[PDB]
């Protein structure tokens, strides 16, 4: 049922850095995730240009932000290309080993955490505000899976049997106790207007 | 031998905008191209993780900037994944129709040209300083081609028989008469230090 994997040593080191380094500008985590969703949404667009049947799993390309104060989660859903089990296991489709190399090296030469995404490892900025992150994903070439980690050197991957989503990725952020501002309508609007104003797909902020 | 294609109406409109709009900050064009090269270099890295034989066409991943004052060209070569003829014809691998949509719409709502790359059409910023742009490209799954355009609503694609490059892309900028500062060692250093300091691959500035 549940498979458990060790993070590579560098990712495990990146995550510990993210979690442990005092750094107040935690809000960038949302920009980095909406920017991954946009990327994943570009890819399915690009693919559907030459093969229109790639969109049979959903023709709408968009991003939804869904807070839930009862569960203490913020969830970014996109109808992008999604990831295959292989992609999930190989660091969620990213060049994360060499990306963390570059990033640590940049951190040496005068970069701050907010720059994480120029190394292609922006996803991990989720650990700025979340204590567990769950990624449900569905790519056309594969079944639906859920990747999950509370950091600590390991992640899990299982097949997901709850709500088929048809196509895309859902990043559920189980927020830290003291990071619940990110569940506020007003606070999320502010960050999307500030950091993600010019994204080429609709972003819908759901209400509770 | 030479095939000739019409730009889609929007790209042709984007290019005319780029060429015709007074906008002094022309130097961003280099950031946008080094950033495409980095992206193309990420992709071959990601692919080679699971299939190491993808690197048989070259194991070095890097970017070279090569001015030539005699020919009045600046050339950005990368050993990235390269593009197939299909990719070249379909707007150099980009979602350019909807990207230009997004960009024009952003330009409405208060964005400037320097933001072009957040819509995935940064390549065309080459027309800020170049009167012709030639792209030689080689992907593992295809032969070597040269795409070329002086704008004006059409591009050409031929197969390239000069210097096999093994794998990657070469963007040759035939610079405009009054844009030759971009051929100066000092000026290029300045722009790379300013806009592209934290790129995860070596950038080599060649000397004349
Ligand atoms: C290759 C086939 N699929 C995908 O690329 C894909 N589908 O869904 C993706 C999403 C991934 C993330 C995180 C988990 C990496 C999201 O937050 C949202 C997505 O939609 C997603 C994806 C999107 C972005 C990235 C990271 N980029 C960052 C810059 O380097 C290249 C890769 C990795 C994966
Ligand atoms: C899909 C298989 N190949 C590639 O993606 C590829 N190989 O070489 C690429 C380069 C492209 C450009 C311009 C011509 C688009 C470069 O300037 C440099 C490259 O190395 C290149 C490429 C790199 C970037 C882009 C544009 N990005 C921009 C953001 O949206 C997604 C696509 C398009 C193509």
UniProtKB/Swiss-Prot annotation, chains A, B:
Amino acids binding ATP: 36, 78, 97, 123
Positions of modified residues (N6-acetyllysine): 43, 69
Region listing for Interaction with NR3C1, in residue ranges: 1-208
Domain of life per record: Eukaryota
Localization (cell): Nucleus; Cytoplasm; Melanosome; Cell membrane
Post-translational modification: ISGylated.
The protein's role, per its UniProt record: Molecular chaperone that promotes the maturation, structural maintenance and proper regulation of specific target proteins involved for instance in cell cycle control and signal transduction. Undergoes a functional cycle that is linked to its ATPase activity which is essential for its chaperone activity. This cycle probably induces conformational changes in the client proteins, thereby causing their activation. Interacts dynamically with various co-chaperones that modulate its substrate recognition, ATPase cycle and chaperone function. (Microbial infection) Seems to interfere with N.meningitidis NadA-mediated invasion of human cells. Decreasing HSP90 levels increases adhesion and entry of E.coli expressing NadA into human Chang cells; increasing its levels leads to decreased adhesion and invasion.
Family affiliation: Belongs to the heat shock protein 90 family.
Subunit organization: Homodimer. Identified in NR3C1/GCR steroid receptor-chaperone complexes formed at least by NR3C1, HSP90AA1 and a variety of proteins containing TPR repeats such as FKBP4, FKBP5, PPID, PPP5C or STIP1. Forms a complex containing HSP90AA1, TSC1 and TSC2; TSC1 is required to recruit TCS2 to the complex. The closed form interacts (via the middle domain and TPR repeat-binding motif) with co-chaperone TSC1 (via C-terminus). Interacts with TOM34. Interacts with TERT; the interaction, together with PTGES3, is required for correct assembly and stabilization of the TERT holoenzyme complex.
Domains as described in the record: The TPR repeat-binding motif mediates interaction with TPR repeat-containing proteins like the co-chaperone STUB1.
The protein's name: Heat shock protein HSP 90-alpha
Recorded name of the encoding gene: HSP90AA1
Full-protein interval shown: 16 to 223 of 732
